[PDB]
């Protein structure tokens, strides 16, 4: 499923992925850790640190600064275990709250971040963070759009229709942005 | 197959995401 590596990266940019600053928080150079789409096909633990810290920070702020206080940036190995045990438990809780909608989190996926098994966990993680923010930034009069999105529809015509509504909304709202900033 | 309706639901997700994100800022910007 190539689009899994695709939508992920797009969804990565959806959270506002800026490869520079998010590499700057770790105190390391970009040239030694490549970002983008073709970054987790092989074992790549640095890109793992970066994307996982950004993904955990985008969803939570205070508890994220708490559980990753004695870990990040995990430059050494004694403090690395702190990161690997603070992230695995959280991902296990998240997977248990959703269940079949998530791949079962295994600590072994964190010993070598790469291959399709890591990309699967990463895409479902990105989906979860998107959704739990569609749960908070969408209006109280529109929270159902979240659960309407959790409703796993199976027919293609309704999927077409839903995309259709959303894309006309997209066009109109981007047009209103121009009206507001210019007028 | 399912892979295409998942593509559709994902793109709907992204539309909804970015739209709400720019709405919450434009409402702030107009006031």
């Amino acid at each position: 499923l190539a689009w899994q590596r695709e939508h992920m990266w797009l969804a990565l940019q959806g959270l506002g992925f800026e490869s520079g600053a998010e590499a700057a928080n770790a105190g390391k150079t970009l040239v030694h850790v490549t970002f983008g789409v073709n970054m987790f096909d092989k074992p790549n633990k640095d890109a793992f640190y970066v994307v996982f810290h950004f993904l955990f920070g985008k969803l939570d702020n205070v508890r994220c600064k708490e559980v990753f206080r004695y870990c990040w940036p995990p430059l050494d190995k004694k403090r690395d275990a702190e990161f690997r045990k603070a992230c695995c438990e959280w991902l296990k809780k998240i997977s248990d709250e959703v269940g079949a909608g998530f791949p079962q989190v295994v600590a072994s996926i964190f010993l070598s971040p790469g291959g399709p098994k890591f990309v699967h966990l990463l895409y479902h993680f990105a989906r979860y963070v998107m959704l739990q923010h569609i749960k908070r930034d969408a209006d109280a009069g529109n929270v159902f759009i979240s659960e309407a999105l959790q409703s796993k529809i199976q027919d293609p015509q309704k999927a077409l229709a839903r995309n259709k509504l959303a894309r006309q909304k997209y066009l109109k709202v981007l047009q209103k942005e121009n009206l507001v900033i210019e007028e | 197959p399912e892979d295409m309706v998942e593509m559709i639901e994902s793109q709907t997700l992204l539309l909804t995401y970015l739209t709400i994100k720019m709405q919450k800022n434009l409402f702030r910007l107009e006031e």
Binding site: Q13, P156, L160, L174 | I8
Partner: peptide
């Protein structure tokens, strides 16, 4: 469906590039 897909993703990536 692929046409709406393409228009979608293109508008997504290009609007993301707006400052």
């Amino acid at each position: 469906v692929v046409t709406c897909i393409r228009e979608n993703e293109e508008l997504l990536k290009e609007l993301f590039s707006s400052p």
